[PDB]
Amino acid sequence: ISKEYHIDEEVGFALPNPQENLPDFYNDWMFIAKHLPDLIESGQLRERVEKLNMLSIDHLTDHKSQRLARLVLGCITMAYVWGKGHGDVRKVLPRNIAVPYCQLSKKLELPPILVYADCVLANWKKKDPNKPLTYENMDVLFSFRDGDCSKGFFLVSLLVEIAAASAIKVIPTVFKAMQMQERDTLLKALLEIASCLEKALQVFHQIHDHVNPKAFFSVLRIYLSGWKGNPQLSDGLVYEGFWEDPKEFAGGSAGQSSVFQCFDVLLGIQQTAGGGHAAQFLQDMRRYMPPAHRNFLCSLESNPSVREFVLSKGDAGLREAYDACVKALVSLRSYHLQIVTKYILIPASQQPGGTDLMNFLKTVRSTTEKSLLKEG
Ligand SMILES: O=C(NCc1ccc2c(c1)CCCN2C(=O)c1cccc(Cl)c1)c1ccc(Cl)cc1
């Protein structure tokens, strides 16, 4: 895969070995970001942010330092807007934080809100570099509140993301085999992809050990919420000193993951076609991905269809290998639906949004299942 797309051999779409510390110039940002749970509880978070001076972004030279600053400012912004998380909000982001956040966001080509690429793909480290990428040798860099299960939620998402890297690297073999008319190589590649997608499902199972239903629904879901079609911020958020009018941006989502879409594109599963709501949403979330990763998706669309090729051959072995990949995606959507039931639907019904996500996932699963050449 070409280096311009920023896809790593080991970790795929995740940022390899992210930066932990900023330069000493930005100590004031780091203190607030490192102690969000404490400052929110004492009721001093909004005070500390308002007392900040406006720091220039020019000392953030390299890409990794810039991605770290985005995560820092992203988490602070979520804490400032939502606060304790029981209705008391802020609709204006002070200039001292809003200006450098938007400047940095424009530079990287991402919107000025916390996205999946911040809080999963760049929000990680390993404890011992000599030891491999396991949960016990890994940690997140930032959290919102004590007992929010942010470590479990983000790290398990990252581990699934890392598992998918074994499949992503096979993609060039698939397209090369098609243009070179190499049937046996194509079959082998498709079987290898299917196997890696099956292993990714098994990695997903870890979520039950590290995430609690109450904690996710009542705490973490609040802080990941955005300001697009939200009654609490009907007009959006005012970024002081940068834009005059308030702007709307969508909150964090699994739809922002590139792995969520790239295998549907590869296999010709028409997810973003027909102008339905699910199709529109998947296209919209491409602008919430890093530019190199959105470029990768549309470049996949530029290549000839893997589905049409496999259909023309009249070869049962090839059809089987194709369906194995499709069946693995059906299994992944089905498991995601189970996770939505446990962590959102049941907690919501017990106390005196979740429905929409279920329906979206049912449409995505339905489209995937009907792309099967033979019934499973
Ligand atoms: O929903 C979240 N996490 C659970 C979750 C839910 C779903 C999937 C993933 C994480 C990670 C990879 C994509 N993903 C798949 O299920 C999938 C689809 C196709 C292929 C493969 Cl290998 C995985 C989540 C939501 C908001 C934020 Cl701010 C961060 C994470």
N-to-C series of helices and strands: HHHHEHHEEHHHHHEHHHHHH
Shape: globular
Largest sheet: 2 strands, parallel
What topology, given as strand order, has the largest sheet?
1-4
As a percent range, the share of helical residues equals 55-70%
Task: Tell me how many strands there are.
Answer: 4
Question: What is the terminal separation in angstroms?
Answer: 32 Å
How many helix segments?
17
Into how many domains do the coordinates divide?
2
List the ions, cofactors and other small molecules found in this model.
Answer: ligand U6G
Global structural class: mainly alpha
Strand content: under 5%
- Please give the radius of gyration in angstroms: 21 Å
Structure description:
With 376 residues, the protein is mainly alpha-helical. It has 2 domains: 1-18 and 147-224 and 250-376, no CATH class; 19-146 and 225-249, no CATH class. The chain contains 17 helices and 4 strands. The chain has helices at residues 27-34, 36-42, 45-50, 63-82, 95-108, 116-119, 150-168, 171-179, 183-204, 207-210, 213-223, 259-266, 277-284, 291-302, 306-312, 316-350, 354-369; strands spanning 92-93, 125-126, 138-139, 238-239. The strands form 2 sheets. It has a two-stranded parallel sheet. A two-stranded antiparallel sheet has the order 2-3. α11 crosses α16 (316-350) and α16 packs antiparallel against α17. The longest helix is centred in the C-terminal third of the chain and has 35 residues, at 316-350. Ligand U6G binds at residues 116, 119-120, 157, 160-161, 164, 197, 200, 224, 252-254, 257, 259-260, 263, 329, 332, 336. The site of ligand U6G has 20 residues, from α6, α7, α9, α12 and α16. The PDB classes it as oxidoreductase. Keywords: indoleamine dioxygenase, heme, inhibitor, oxidoreductase, OXIDOREDUCTASE-OXIDOREDUCTASE inhibitor complex. The assembly is monomeric. Human IDO1 in complex with compound 4.
